[PDB]
Amino acid sequence: SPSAQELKEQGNRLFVGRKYPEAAACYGRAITRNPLVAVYYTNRALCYLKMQQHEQALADCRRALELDGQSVKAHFFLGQCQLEMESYDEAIANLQRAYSLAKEQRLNFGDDIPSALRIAKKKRWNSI
Ligand SMILES: CNC(=O)C[C@H](NC(=O)[C@@H]1CCC[C@H]1NC(=O)c1n[nH]c2c1CCCC2)c1ccccc1OC
């Protein structure tokens, strides 16, 4: 029987290989062993996003946020998901929140969050 962390790493490896259903199933098996780890839900939300399953991706972001309200990644993926759903105002607020949390936690993602914010703001404007 593999451990929860072994399953998270197998899921990450599968994600790098673009095997999204397989990766989501590994994160699900990690959750079965330990359902109190926010990053398992955040990682699976990204799989759901790659599989275009937006309602499932939102639900995993919410499960991650309930365990870790300070999650930079859960707010970032929530915002990206909302952007694809055309919920622009909500997307921008979550991306801005990921930016502020990353700055407070002294995390370095280069121009990842400002770039995502610019895409969302341009998409919101183009629709207006
Ligand atoms: C944004 N893309 C991912 O989070 C994919 C994820 N990458 C990581 O965990 C990177 C390894 C070390 C550094 C880390 N970077 C980030 O966390 C990251 N970068 N820009 C941002 C963030 C977080 C949110 C704001 C923008 C990943 C990689 C391999 C396999 C699976 C897997 O995730 C399921």
UniProtKB/Swiss-Prot annotation:
The modification Phosphoserine is found at residues 1, 3, 127. Induction: Up-regulated by inflammatory signals in regulatory T-cells (Treg). It comes from the Eukaryota. It is found in: Cytoplasm; Nucleus; Mitochondrion. TPR repeats lie at residues 4-37, 38-71, 73-105. Changing residue 43 to S: In SCAR16; reduces protein level; reduces ubiquitin ligase activity; does not change autoubiquitination. Auto-ubiquitinated; mediated by UBE2D1 and UBE2D2 and enhanced in the presence of MAP2K5. Expressed in differentiated myotubes (at protein level). Highly expressed in skeletal muscle, heart, pancreas, brain and placenta. Detected in kidney, liver and lung. Homodimer. Interacts with BAG2. Interacts with E2 ubiquitin conjugating enzymes UBE2D1, UBE2D2 and UBE2D3. Detected in a ternary complex containing STUB1, HSPA1A and HSPBP1. Part of a complex composed of STUB1/CHIP, VCP/p97, CHRNA3, and UBXN2A that modulates the ubiquitination and endoplasmic reticulum-associated degradation (ERAD) of CHRNA3. Within the complex UBXN2A acts as a scaffold protein required for the interaction of CHRNA3 with VCP/p97, this interaction also inhibits CHRNA3 ubiquitination by STUB1/CHIP and subsequently ERAD. Interacts with MKKS. Interacts with DNAAF4. The U-box domain is required for the ubiquitin protein ligase activity. The TPR domain is essential for ubiquitination mediated by UBE2D1. E3 ubiquitin-protein ligase which targets misfolded chaperone substrates towards proteasomal degradation. Plays a role in the maintenance of mitochondrial morphology and promotes mitophagic removal of dysfunctional mitochondria; thereby acts as a protector against apoptosis in response to cellular stress. Negatively regulates vascular smooth muscle contraction, via degradation of the transcriptional activator MYOCD and subsequent loss of transcription of genes involved in vascular smooth muscle contraction. It is linked to Spinocerebellar ataxia, autosomal recessive, 16: A form of spinocerebellar ataxia, a clinically and genetically heterogeneous group of cerebellar disorders. Patients show progressive incoordination of gait and often poor coordination of hands, speech and eye movements, due to degeneration of the cerebellum with variable involvement of the brainstem and spinal cord. SCAR16 is characterized by truncal and limb ataxia resulting in gait instability. Additionally, patients may show dysarthria, nystagmus, spasticity of the lower limbs, and mild peripheral sensory neuropathy. Antibodies against STUB1 are found in patients with chronic lymphocytic leukemia (CLL) and in colorectal cancer patients. This is E3 ubiquitin-protein ligase CHIP. It comes from Homo sapiens (Human). The gene is STUB1. The chain holds residues 23 to 150 of 303 of the full protein.
